[PDB]
Structure formats: structure tokens, C-alpha cells
């Protein structure tokens, strides 16, 4: 096109848009709209989309020509965001193609990587000392070593660059991935690297959905070579509207949802619809996962006081063929969920970490499944299978609601707010009721106590009662209503979760608070006793009392925001009592097995075994001090344990690091 | 712009009285306000063209040194330093617009390098012919080698160290102060370089007001990401205490009116913690006395008095290690949350690192060094670093961390009242076993803590009820259980203001009450407690923990004098550390 044709057309339309930009000279941008430009000239809006390389540069010079006029000669606002915020079409990372190259497009998604703000060398001048040839060579972000081999005057080889004569602008590398909210089942998300420039860098960190708009460029392809797969999206306009494109949605079925919520058994109808009817055998176990799909009330208070209302359900010690893995695919009906295993097949893992990039040599900060799924859920198929570096940040991601990544040196501290409904397979082939939850899992005991609900499913061993009910509800279920009988659809139940989590906010009453306070105090005295030379196990800890209100706030979200929550507080404490009937019930409701790897009686018997060991740890009666044959007779006479019980505790002290053994028949305290 | 006449314009200005007393010194501190009165365009040319204007200011010192009124020995080693500038930057204010511009960025030093020599004048000689080539290498440039010879063009041109002049070099990371600057954003660090006269001017871990010129280093292949924000330091000096301390001048008339109320002691305790806890009232008094620390006076003839009361909050992980270290960190100034095990190599104390771009043994300052006057509320103190354990004893009896590493032999002052807390090594401990043996902490380390409180989920009726009543009403959001008496921003200004002005001194009636308590605890109870080798319940070091809490209770009153009833308040809290 012509030079002055697009300059005169842009100066006529845009003025009031440059008057507000003249007040803030450091911004150097303008919030242009596609509907505002098309109302004046429809050909001007279509010309910028088809060719945004030089038409937007002449439009930026048109704003400079309005600033360099005779009436208005203010030498401010040289650069301007010529890319409009409003767009006629918003492309995605999954629908991206090669037909939109060298054009203006809007990409929506989430950010995963973010590089450090470094200076970009643009319009690099080169002046020699022996020849003195004045020449400038333009350098791009993807270009490398853009310099001449010799001078054009005398062919000098000692060419020096001028950093003062050249232009230095801000540069930042970011990776835009697909959003997990709009991504359905059976979809592979693709990643596309972008570049942030001056007046647009440090716009958003990793772990949040951000909108991107600008010119989509590509790497230079040489002749007789392979096609370059490197594609860089030069984002120009800084705007945050991807959250309103995905999360903000009109729900016309909310008027029909008032008729369904006014009837009875509405909580039991949603539990039977959000789970597959083919998987049967557990009602209260599936009710805890169904109540965990709706969050609680997260309000701010002074002095940094906050309380999370996300109940994390974790199952350990499950069988080989368990229905919880098939229910994990049905657990993705909640919004902003990501169905990925614990082994994320990346250097970042589940939490955020710093990974080296091959396209940009600068250090970037990646984001895992716990950061990109903030505000929703994050289902993990293998909670036990995790890296050691990811396990060091999982203790703060589920507790302090932040990943707290500080190994990169920038201390980004990405937020980790995801209601994780995970599951973990046992290390052994079968599960037993004698072993605790921390002994039958690879994870530490600090992550098991943080979970609000812990369930363990197991079938009957005898085939007279197990096989007569297992295959009876599965053989006739083929091509019938026994496999699937949802009263409401899965997409219809997912639409009701968005109206209850964002708009509905229930609160319990004083009578409902008295039900949770009296039940926690009555069970505290039913299991209270006196421990000899030790501390008695508490029935319910104070940290577990905060999870009892989280189960009550989740059931009150489906109770149409009732003030008197006494009807839902009884089932919330009964669901926690069913989990406490088997888990953390070692001695008598002993919660020490949930907060620590060793229980109350497991540590008291080890302390009684320490009395028989430290009394002769220095006296070498056998091969070393405190011989194992002498300590077994001292423990059996005192009532600590038998010969098979002390042998299971001798190897447990060597694994935990309390008592080792130099030779066979002698165990010395470490 | 011409530098032949710019030295003549600097001769009319030349800051003249500073040169007569610094003529043995190797640096001249020149204020820009003296230069702004003479020529405002020249003082603005320092920020716009910092490369050649400082070089003319370096030249103009030698002109007045050879002047007929002021003739001295010709000293070309004269640094043209400029301390004051009319703009002070922020954490993320450094950018590409300030490339080759004299800026002033305030911050703290997190990492430092060892004393290394630099090749300022890099003389290159050849092996085959012997071309005596010279090339002045800049300290802000990457390590470069000449390709060919100027005579024959060979690869044998190497740097000889005999005819090459050297210059003292040191690099430090200027990660700025994380005092909620730039809206609580992630702090960005810009590594700087020190000069010959500016080497060892500051230790890692002090508040520094340093100026410099931001320049670039070619490091990568891509033109956009090959940049290193290296600040060529022109002048380095300590930060003033007015910018360091908080402005309590709008909060001055509120805190004096709080002394009119007789409940000022109980007001700064239930508001120092959140009211949703509703437990550990004697430990709530212990954390309140830890914030209002004792007087850090300097004893004469080279000594110092410990005015910090480290409170050990070890106990059961159920109640302790839970929210007691988070509400204090938002209220107390310069308080950084840190855990015992961390991905950082420093962690608690200042641990040295060997990895650098040079390879020398660098020193990375820990969180106890970056908390000068702060509160490092360490969580999980049992799983600490073994290298940190060798220096955690000196940090709690001297408030210094002597690293004694390779290249860096200077000590690092801690000055941080730490509130440490740890899990037991065995789990579910009780008073039937002895306290310092059943923990990971040594018995000599627990004597450094002035207060050792024990927290456990007791199965008592009212204690289980009072947590059950209060945690349910704070969920519903009543103002009587959530809103404190004084605001949190008012008490945060009450802590920093009380430590600056008022200082409790001992009185005659207050010392008499300590005489009746000390002699009572060891008349027969001394012989009854020890078995000949067993430790004493109260010793002379235990007395230092009592008079520190005596000045701590008077600091909450700000009455400047201690009394008998004020020292009696320090008696019962010391007895709580011995009994529980």
C-alpha cells in the first residue's frame, strides 16, 4: 500500500484517544477497538488484520504525525499499541495454523513459562576504528550474530558495536499453552512461545490465563532446507480478557435449577449423576468426592488471615483393579480440572520449578499442574508417584496455598489453590488393616494429615458375598440402565457447579456450630486415657476441626445457602466419622498415625524397647552393646513385644534411623 | 558536550573542602546538590552521559591537585564518586531505558564474591614474533581474547601477566529489600561490580544505598536475550536509618494516647497475635516480649550486651508449628518466613557457595544475616543444615556469623531475634523424658533460647471446648472474635517506634525484687535439683534472660523506667519457661 494513504486515514479517525495518552507519557499505548475503527472506515479495520507488519507502523507514525503537527507539536507518545484490544476473531492454540502467519490475530490461553526482563538489542550500529564505516544492521529476537564479515569501504574486520547509538528495549519470553477449562476429554494441548517487548513485558506470571494479541511471525526459512518449526508470536497489545471469555458465561438454566433444588434428595441426585452407575459398592466414599467438587467460602481478613475451603480427598492402599481410577475420569466434571498423573513427564513436575530453555538462553520459570489449575481442581492418578524435588514443594502448595518457588533466584511464589482429588496405589500387592496409611505409602505423613477426607476401599475376600454382587450388577449392565442412570447430565451438573461456587455463599448458624463443637468435645473424652511414660493419643486434632467445617461448608453449598445448617452438619460429621472409623483409629481414635509415621502405641512400645536398649547400649555383652538376643528377653518379660514383634521393630528402627546393627545378634542405638 | 572545555567548567566548581582531607584517600565523594547550584545542565549530564562526564570529573581533580594554590604530589588514582542523585530507584525500576545512565538503586547485599584481581590493561604478546600489543579491557565487558596478530595474524597472541596492570575486582548481587516494594512483586536482582577503591566496602547483608551505571554483557547468540544488567558502581555508601525505619509520625498521637489506658499491657498481646487462636496466653506474652526486645547498649572498652530474647516454641506439630509464625511475620518489621530445610544453599546461616562465573568461593548470606533488626521466625528447626549448625551457636550468643571460608574471612552480623520452633525427633514427647535429649537440638543450644514454651493438644475438657467454640465463631465472622482492640497497622507502627526512642533503665526498687526471686530458687532447691553433675535451674546466664524480659515489659509501657511490679511481671514468665 501507499505510505501517506494509511497515515492520513488514521489521523482523521484518531483526538480524544491521544489526549489521554498525552497525560501519561510513560504508557505510550492506546486501547483501540475494532468496532470503533469499523464505524468510521470498514476497510481500515480489515487492512490491519491482513497486513500488520508495515500498516501498523505507518499508523503509529500517523499518531506521531498528529503529535508533530503545527498546532500540536508535543514530542510525546512516539510508540503506540496499534493492535486493537477488541478483535473480530479470537484464535486458539489448538486451532492455530500456518494460514495466519504474518497477520494480526488474538490468541487466548494460559501462560506456563516466563523469562527475566533483559535488554533487547535493536538497530545495532557498527563503526570501525581503522576504517570508520557508518552503517546500521537491524537485529531481530530470533536472529543470531547479525553482523557483516567486512566493511563496505576498506573491508575492515575489527568492527565495534555502539550501545549508546543503538536502541535498547525491554524483552521477555513467555510460553502460551491451552487453557484446561475449555479443554474437554481426549485433547492434547499444544504450546506456543511468545515474546514480550517494551511497555508490554511483566504483564502476567505463570499460572494464570492471559490474553495475547499481535502479529504472528515465524523463523526465516532458507532455500533448499527443511521447514523451520520455530514460530514466535509478537504480542503488541497488552490486555487481560481471556478470563471473561472462558470463566464468565451466561447460565440460562439457573431458573430451571431453582425448581430442581426446591425438591428433596437434591444432594443424593447430584452424587448419582456425577459418578458412573456401573461403578458400585461405595456410597459414603463417593459422597465425599462429590462434596469436594464444590468449594467453600474464601474471604480475606486483616493481618494476612485466611482460611482455605478446598477439601482434598486422597485414597491410599487401593486394589489393583479399582473403580476410583475410573471415577477419576468422572471426577473431571468439575471446572478448571486437569486429569494428569503425578509423574508429569517434565522437569517442573506438579509444582513450579525453573527449567532451562533451548530457544532462549535466559532462565525461565515453568508452571506445573498445581499452578496452572488455580481456582479449580487438579486430579492426580498417582499421588504416590512423584519426584523428590516436587515433594519438597507439595508441603507448602497444599497448606499455604502457594508454590513458594525460590530456587530460581527471583522468588516468584506462584499460587497453588486447587482442590486435589487424588489417589495412590499401594507398594504391595495387597492391602491389610494392620499396616497404617503412612507405612503403606511412599509419601510422607505430613501430606496425609492435610487431606480433609481419606478413604480406603476393599472388596470381600469370600466369593459367597463378593462375587454374587460384583458380577450381578455388571453382566446385566451391558446395554442397560444399570451401567448409567443419570437423572441429570454431566454437562448440566457442571453448569450448576459454576453458579454455586461463584454466586452462592452459605453460612452456618449458632445451632449448627454447636453441633460441630459438641461432637468434637464428646469424642475427645470418649477416647481420653492416661499414657504411662508418654502422651495419650488425641481423638480429633485442632487441625482436623477446621476440616470438619470445610465438609459442612461444602454440604451447605448444595443446601440453597440455608442459614440454619443443622441438617447438613450432621452428615458432615458422620462422613468424617466414617473415615475416622478405619483410618487414624490405631489405638483408640489415634490421630498420631495420620500426623506422624509412627502411631501412639508404636512409639510407646519403641520407647519401652529403648528402655531395654539404652540400659546396656554401652555395655557390650555380645558382639556389640545391647545384644538382640538379650533385648528380646528383656522386651518379652516386660511386655513390650514377642520375638516376632521385636524383629519387626528392630528393622523399623534401622529404616527410621533410631537403632542400627553392626552384626547379627546385636542392635546398638544410633 | 566537548570534554576539552568540560574540565574547565568543572574547574570553576572544584566539594573542595572534601579533597583536602581525602588526599591520602583514593575516592572523592562529590554531592550533586553542590554541582546543581553551579550548573544544572552539568548535573543532568551525569545521568544522561555517564561515560565521559565522570572521566572529565576524574581529570578535573588532577588539575586542582596541580594548581599553583593547591599543588600536591601528582596522584592519578582519584575516583570521581557521586553519592547524591536527585532520583532513587526501586526493585524493578531498572530497565532498558536506564542502560548507560547513572542511576541510584537502594537494596541489600545477598551474595558477594571473593577478592579477585582483574586485567584492566590487558597486554598481549605473541609467541612466534613477539608483538607488544596493548588493549584496555573494561570491567563491565565479558572475558574476551584477541583473534589474530596485528603483524602476522596467528593464534599465539596470549596475555602476559608481567607487563599487564591489574585492578581490584569484586562482584555482589544487589537483590533489593523485600519490604513489600512494587506491590509485593517478585524481587529482581541486578548483579554489580566493585572497583579498586570500592572493594570490601560492604559485607553481604547490610542496607546499602549504591549508585552505578547499568551496562550490558554479550552472553548468548540471540540478540534480544543476550543481556546482563551489570551495574558499574561509581559510589557505594550505607543506607540512612530514616529510609530503613518506618514513618511512625502519623501514628505518633495514637500511641501516646494508648499509654493513658491502663490496659496497654494486655492490648499489645492479644493484638500481636490473631484473636482466633484463643490459647497459649503465657506464650502470647512470650512472643510479645520477644518483639519488644531489650536495650542493645554497647558496654565500654569493647563489649556488647545481648538485647534479644529468642523464644523457643518447640512442641507437638498439631498446635505448634501452625499459624504462630505467620501472624507475627506480617506484624513485626523485617520478618522473613523461613523453614529449616530449604532448596537454597544458605538456608538459615550464611553458607558459602563455590559456583561462580569465575569459580571462586562466593558467600551467600542467609536469612539471619538479611534480617538486621528483624525476626527470622524459623519453622522446623530440627531439620536444619549441618553446615548451619556449626554457626548457629555463634549467632545466638554474639549475633555474628564468622564464616572463615576461602576468600571471605570477615564475619557477618546476624542481629536477628529468631523465634525458632521444631518437631520432636521421636514424636509425641512428654515430661517423663528429659527435654534437651529427646530433641534434635543440643542441650548447649537450648540454653541460648531465653524462653522455651511447650505446646501440645491436651485432652482436657475446657481446652478442647475453647478451641471448638472460638474456631466456629471466627468462621461465621463475628467482630468480637476477629477484630482486635487496636488495629494491626497501628501495632506494627507501635513496635518500630518504641525501639527507637524509649529505653528502659534499671531502678532501685526493681533490682530488689530480683534479689528475693534469685535467692529463693537456689536455697536448697539448687542441691535438690542437681545430682552433682546435673545442670543448675537458674544460673548467671538465666539472669540475663530475666532482665531482658524486665526491659521487654517496660517497652510495652514505654515508661522508660522499670519498677517492682514491672519486674514481677518478668518473674512469672521466667517461671513458666522452667515449669513448662
Numbering used by the authors:
A (entry chain F): 1 to 14, 27 to 682
B (entry chain E): 1 to 14, 29 to 594
Text taken from the publication that reported this structure:
We developed an affinity-grid method employing monodispersed single particle streptavidin on a lipid monolayer to enhance particle absorption on the grid surface and alleviate sample exposure to the air-water interface. Here we generated streptavidin affinity grids with monodispersed single particle streptavidin (mspSA) on lipid monolayers, which allowed for high-resolution structure determination of challenging samples. Affinity grids could alleviate both issues by enriching the particles on to the grid and keeping them away from the AWI. Taken together, we developed mspSA affinity method which enabled the structure determination of archaea MCM and in complex with dsDNA, HIV-1 CA Di-hexamer and ScPol II EC, while providing essential insights into DNA replication initiation.
DNA replication is a fundamental process for cells, during which MCM helicases play essential roles in the initiation and elongation steps. Tko has three MCM genes (mcm1-3), among which mcm3 is the one essential for DNA replication. To enrich the MCM helicase on cryoEM grids, MCM was randomly biotinylated at its surface lysine residues. The average number of biotinylated MCM particles on the affinity grid was 316.2 per micrograph, compared to 7.5 particles per micrograph without biotinylation. We obtained a cryoEM map of MCM-apo hexamer at an overall resolution of 3.26 Å. As indicated by the local resolution, the MCM-apo is highly flexible, especially at the two peripheral MCM subunits. The MCM-apo structure shows six MCM monomers, interestingly, arranged as a left-handed open spiral. The MCM-apo forms double hexameric rings, but flexible relative to each other. The main difference between MCM-apo and MCM-ATP-dsDNA lies in the appearance of the WH motif: in MCM-apo, the WH motif shows in every other MCM monomer, i.e., B, D, and F. While in MCM-ATP-dsDNA, the WH motif shows from the second MCM to the last monomer, i.e., B, C, D, E, and F. While Tko MCM-apo constitutes a wide-open gate (20 Å), large enough to fit dsDNA, the open MCM-Cdt1-apo from human and yeast has a very narrow gate (4–6 Å).
